[PDB]
């Protein structure tokens, strides 16, 4: 069904986060809180892990629960990509202009609220 | 319908602008206004958010409202992509040739007017 398209989208997004994270110049003088680096690593690794898990589960085929899990994986891949962009711009610009990073964060909060509201809806309705 | 193609192209363009924002090298002695960096961050994050919203709407599939919302999301993704390209060329060239960046702005102005007028038209007819 839609599993092929969703898996393709998640694979593309994961590959985009990976090619991003590999080509990131860092420095020992960086001012980012180490929690930012920890969250960057966690977000990128979780995105690629979820994409691979979705691909494996889709191509390896209670059952409608697994389909709902597939949809949840797609939505979580989307949200993790959004948070990846947030953390990426943060760790990119925090040494130059903290206001740029904080403005990017504050303007991405409402769309994250909308996404998490849909996710919380589907989790309150998660079987 | 045309939802899958829109999802594919919007995700591609969003990730494209993302890695572009990844490969921007600045300095603490830059001449770009801080408002330019703020606009860079806001525009990139908004483009990513709109593309992700379009992807989620495609995954979702009274229906006419949803179809119009999907088309409007694709249109706004195009708007933000063009504006992001303008900002990216500006920040890339402003350190050497301010006239180059200004020329890039005045060469993307007319198509921006065309798309804004097209956006107002559909938005006016959107409910």
């Amino acid at each position: 069904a839609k599993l092929k398209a969703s898996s393709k989208t998640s694979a593309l997004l994961s590959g985009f986060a990976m090619v991003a994270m590999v080509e990131v110049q860092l420095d020992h003088d960086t001012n980012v809180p180490p929690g930012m680096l920890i969250a960057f690593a966690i977000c990128t690794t979780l995105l690629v892990a979820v994409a691979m898990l979705a691909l494996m589960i889709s191509t390896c085929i209670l059952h409608w629960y697994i389909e709902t899990a597939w949809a949840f994986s797609t939505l979580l891949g989307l949200i993790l990509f959004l948070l990846e962009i947030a953390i990426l711009c943060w760790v990119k610009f925090y040494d130059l202009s903290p206001p740029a990073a904080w403005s990017a964060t504050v303007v991405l909060i409402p769309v994250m609220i909308i996404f998490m509201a849909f996710a919380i809806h589907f989790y309150r309705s998660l079987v | 319908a045309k939802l899958k193609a829109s999802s594919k192209t919007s995700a591609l363009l969003s990730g494209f602008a993302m890695v572009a924002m990844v490969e921007v090298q600045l300095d603490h002695d830059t001449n770009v206004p801080p408002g330019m960096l703020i606009a860079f961050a806001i525009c990139t994050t908004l483009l990513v958010a709109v593309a992700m919203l379009a992807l989620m709407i495609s995954t979702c599939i009274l229906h006419w409202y949803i179809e119009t919302a999907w088309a409007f999301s694709t249109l706004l993704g195009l708007i933000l992509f063009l504006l992001e390209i303008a900002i990216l060329c500006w920040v890339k060239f402003y350190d050497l040739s301010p006239p180059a960046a200004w020329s890039a702005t005045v060469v993307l102005i007319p198509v921006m007017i065309i798309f804004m007028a097209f956006a107002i038209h559909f938005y006016r007819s959107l409910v």
Partner: antibody, heavy 115, light 107 residues
Framework: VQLVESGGGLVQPKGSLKLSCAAS????????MHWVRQAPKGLEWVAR???????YYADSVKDRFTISRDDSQSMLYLQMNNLKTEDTAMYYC???????????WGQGTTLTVSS | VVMTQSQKFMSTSVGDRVSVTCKAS??????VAWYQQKPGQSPKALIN???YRNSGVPDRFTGGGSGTDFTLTINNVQSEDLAEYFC?????????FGAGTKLELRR
């Protein structure tokens, strides 16, 4: 990041001297530098150099002070002349990061101009 | 651009919140920095862009305002934080500093 500067002490009016500031702990070639004075408590700005290599000078001493950055030697110098009895102050060499706000100040250097 | 200072000696007890002000003259936006000078040392950078604290700064210092008026405040003011505080506009050379106000004590 560590900045230490060392000029001279008491001089004579209408005299001259050059204060030097060694910076160690960052890329000197990619940071605009400043000299900021503080009389015996109102801190006042003195000079700025954009290490093209432009310079900017305060509203008062645009004639008697001149800065210079040796990127290879990695030091910031300011030569002053025709000093008045109202130039006695401590001189911190600081660096600027894209906000025109200083973050890493030096240690100070007393420069008394008396008779 | 010139920056005034209302009171030079903020007579304040321990642990109590204090508000130091800085009424700039022109419209300077949010390009204001705040520096703290302990008596006899090189002043350190407390606040940049009038809102964001620096890296190694305790979080009793919150600075706000915009345009022409700005204000730093310290809830739960310590005792070792008796020092002087300067505000500086970061918008247009020459970069000027406020007259500076110390952080006094009442006992």
């Amino acid at each position: 990041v560590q900045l230490v500067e060392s000029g001279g002490g008491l001089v004579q009016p209408k005299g001259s001297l050059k204060l030097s500031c060694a910076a160690s702990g960052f890329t000197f070639n990619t940071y605009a530098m400043h000299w900021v004075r503080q009389a015996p408590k109102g801190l006042e700005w003195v000079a700025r150099i954009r290490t093209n290599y432009a310079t900017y000078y305060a509203d008062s001493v645009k004639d008697r002070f001149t800065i210079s950055r040796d990127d290879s030697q990695s030091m910031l110098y300011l030569q002053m002349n025709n000093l008045k009895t109202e130039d006695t102050a401590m001189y911190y060499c600081v660096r600027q990061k894209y906000g025109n706000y200083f973050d890493y100040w030096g240690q100070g250097t007393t420069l008394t101009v008396s008779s | 651009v010139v920056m005034t200072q209302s009171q030079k000696f903020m007579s304040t007890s321990v642990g109590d919140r204090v508000s130091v002000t800085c009424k700039a003259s022109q419209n300077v936006g949010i390009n204001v920095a705040w520096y703290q000078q302990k008596p006899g040392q090189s002043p350190k950078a407390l606040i940049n862009s009038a809102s964001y604290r620096n890296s190694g700064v305790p979080d009793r210092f919150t600075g706000g305002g915009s345009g022409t008026d700005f204000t730093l405040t310290i809830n739960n003011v310590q005792s070792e934080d008796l020092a002087e505080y300067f505000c500086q506009q970061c918008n247009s050379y020459p970069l000027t500093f406020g007259a500076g106000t110390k952080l006094e004590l009442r006992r």
